[PDB]
């Protein structure tokens, strides 16, 4: 009990790890409502929770498909404390591919989950934190949300959108007690990439470039990808702040890339640097 | 004429003005297909085309509703010259109000017109450009796309999505001889805002208050700082002119001190406080 937390997308990767990290906190002060798109996939979560030995009642899972506003309401109605102190917007999908090759459904789907879904959670939940003048909104950051990456145009679009959405609300919410923070992450070892996935819809040059990008991402992800457990610690950090900043970074690694991006509004610099980073 | 320009959102504001500025060019080098979401509202385009006297055959309008891919294909197939030298993705929409007060179809249209709508345009026009090894794609920027503005949360999300889409595509296109640039705009006197909004029920009194506090400020800013749809149109020309154009063209320096401010603060709270003070004193 105390500190009701409600996290989205906890079947795996980040959701699952922060769920049980929070529920197994030595302080025992968190009540965790791990929500998932489909409960039948909750095996691992529970096994992890069970393996960690969490106070009974410290974990509860609800079904919440962030792309359905009815699902959202319902789960909210299932939070018995009638309050959420920490709201975690963590679900999201990637989408890779030459822009001309991406399909309408995939595009829409990405935007609906990553952006539109955070919008739904907040509408359903800001109100009562604002009214209670207390609440903490933590949103899962992503680096392809801070800078453009070749072949991930739509993913990046949907990921920059969260920044924008988040940045607008913090400008407002400051005064109401509610604090929003993004936990920005680089590659992380989750279920993410395995799910993320042309010849007939792209031209020979983009095609070969695609394949060249592809190969490299995978080698690099494997080299940089952090642990999903490393990332929960950052969410804990932020949520431990007395006055939390709007950005928390899970690694210093992209920092350098970011600064030369910001050091040049025309953007010509980043473009060249990123083209060479990706195609040598 | 020769440079074939294709512009979306030409029933008014920047679309309209860019469309007849180019068409009435002395050089007379451009052919302009000004597309309109609904051709029936093209009378003002024509009257203005007339007012600057675009020679016959310099301007052709078409229906293109960026929300519908069949509309896109059709427009594309009515480009007689079979090629587009400049693609101006301009149609866009605003949405203003407490997040919690915004309607699900409102939030969705804003993302589909603004974000998916440019994704549909490029998917259709880019390929041939890439084949040609030549083309210039200009996208109407927006400052709500570079930094966050209270009570404009979804408008800003859709606008930061055009930056990620265009920057992501720019890293790739670099070596293809295809040029994509964002014309970043601060406030402008177009129809944009008359439609942005006109709450009590859908939000608390505390938020309701801030809302009005914000409308006070924005109205003042538009009033004392907006630019003309034609001031803006000279930037797309500057941008289309440069032989080696950048990703961004700002139509004003105005929010550049505030842009840097943000730029030199990764953690993001300096900008949040400044913006906070700067709007709700
Ligand atoms: N992995 C990385 O390297 C990385 C880097 C930066 C940012 N991120 C971001 O971190 C979050 C992804 O976490 P992850 O890396 O752990 O990915 P993941 O392992 O694939 O886990 C994501 C979770 O999101 C869920 N989800 C998908 N659609 C949903 C929906 N409609 N409603 C509710 N839940 C849904 C998934 O459930 P199902 O499995 O049932 O579909 C899964 O539980 C997103 O914000 C992602 O963009 C990840
Ligand atoms: N006004 C500003 O202060 C400002 C500032 C920065 C950026 N911008 C941007 O520049 C663009 C132009 O807007 P504006 O300022 O010129 O105001 P505007 O006069 O309202 O321009 C909007 C035009 O685009 C059209 N459009 C809307 N939805 C469409 C759709 N689904 N399919 C095709 N066309 C559609 C509108 O059609 P209908 O007439 O039929 O509605 C209208 O012709 C937008 O991207 C806007 O975000 C404007
Ligand atoms: C797209 C991400 C950003 C930065 C990463 C990167 C950054 C630079 C680069 O040359 C390749 C990659 C591939 C994998 C990427 C990441 C996987 C998820 C993350 O958001
Ligand atoms: C972001 C825009 C330019 C900046 C404008 C601004 C900038 C500062 C501010 O305090 C209020 C407003 C009102 C609306 C904004 C605009 C709406 C559309 C445009 O993109």
Swiss-Prot record, chain A:
The entry marks the following residues as binding substrate, namely 142
E.C. code = 1.1.1.51, 1.1.1.62
Q: Which InterPro entries does the UniProt record give?
A: 17beta_DH, NAD(P)-bd_dom_sf, Sc_DH/Rdtase_CS, SDR_fam
Where along this sequence does the record place binding of NADP(+)? 9-37, 65, 159
Q: Which residues carry this modification: Phosphoserine?
A: 134
Its principal location? cytoplasm
Q: Provide the gene name from the record.
A: HSD17B1
PROSITE patterns xrefs: ADH_SHORT (PS00061)
Q: Which SUPFAM superfamilies match?
A: NAD(P)-binding Rossmann-fold domains
Pfam families to which the protein is assigned, alphabetical? adh_short
Please give the catalytic activity noted in the UniProt record. 17beta-estradiol + NAD(+) = estrone + NADH + H(+); 17beta-estradiol + NADP(+) = estrone + NADPH + H(+); testosterone + NADP(+) = androst-4-ene-3,17-dione + NADPH + H(+)
Q: Which domain of life is it from?
A: Eukaryota
| Function of the molecule | Favors the reduction of estrogens and androgens. Converts estrone (E1) to a more potent estrogen, 17beta-estradiol (E2). Also has 20-alpha-HSD activity. Uses preferentially NADH.
Q: Name one GO biological process term.
A: cellular response to metal ion
The entry's keywords? Cytoplasm, Lipid biosynthesis, Lipid metabolism, NADP, Oxidoreductase, Phosphoprotein, Steroid biosynthesis
| Annotated effect of mutating residue 149 to V | Alters substrate specificity
Q: Molecular function (GO) terms listed?
A: 17-beta-hydroxysteroid dehydrogenase (NADP+) activity; catalytic activity; estradiol 17-beta-dehydrogenase [NAD(P)+] activity; estradiol binding; NADP binding; NADP+ binding; protein homodimerization activity; small molecule binding
Q: Which residues form the active site?
A: 155 (proton acceptor)
Gene3D superfamilies under this entry?
A: NAD(P)-binding Rossmann-like Domain (3.40.50.720)
Q: What's the subunit arrangement here?
A: Homodimer. Exists predominantly as a homodimer but also exits as monomer.
Where is the protein situated, by its record's location annotation? Answer: Cytoplasm
Name listed for the protein in its UniProt record: 17-beta-hydroxysteroid dehydrogenase type 1
Any one GO CC term of the record: cytoplasm
């Amino acid at each position: 009990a105390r500190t009701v937390v409600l996290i989205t997308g906890c079947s795996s990767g980040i959701g699952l790890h922060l769920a049980v990290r929070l529920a197994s906190d030595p302080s025992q002060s968190f009540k965790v409502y791990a929500t998932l798109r489909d409960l039948k996939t909750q095996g691992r979560l529970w096994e992890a929770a069970r393996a960690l030995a969490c106070p009974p009642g410290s974990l509860e899972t609800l079904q919440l498909d962030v792309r359905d506003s009815k699902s959202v309401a319902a789960a909210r109605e299932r939070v018995t404390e009638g309050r959420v102190d920490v709201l975690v917007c963590n679900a999201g999908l990637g989408l890779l591919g030459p822009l001309e090759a991406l399909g309408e459904d995939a595009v829409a789907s990405v935007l609906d989950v990553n952006v539109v879904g955070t919008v739904r959670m907040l509408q359903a939940f800001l109100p009562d934190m604002k009214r209670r003048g207390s609440g903490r909104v933590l949103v899962t950051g992503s680096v392809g949300g801070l800078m453009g990456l070749p072949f991930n145009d739509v993913y990046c679009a949907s990921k920059f959108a969260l920044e924008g959405l988040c940045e607008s609300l913090a400008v407002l919410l400051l005064p109401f007690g509610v604090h929003l923070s993004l936990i920005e992450c680089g590659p992380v070892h989750t279920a993410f990439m395995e799910k993320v996935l042309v010849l007939d819809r792209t031209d020979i040059h983009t095609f070969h470039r695609f394949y060249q990008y592809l190969a490299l991402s995978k080698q690099v992800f494997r080299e940089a990808a952090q642990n999903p457990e490393e990332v929960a610690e950052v969410f804990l950090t932020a949520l431990r702040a007395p006055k939390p900043t709007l950005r928390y970074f899970t690694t210093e690694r992209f920092l350098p890339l970011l600064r030369m991006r910001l050091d040049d509004p025309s953007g010509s610099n980043y473009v060249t640097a990123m083209h060479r980073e990706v195609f040598g």
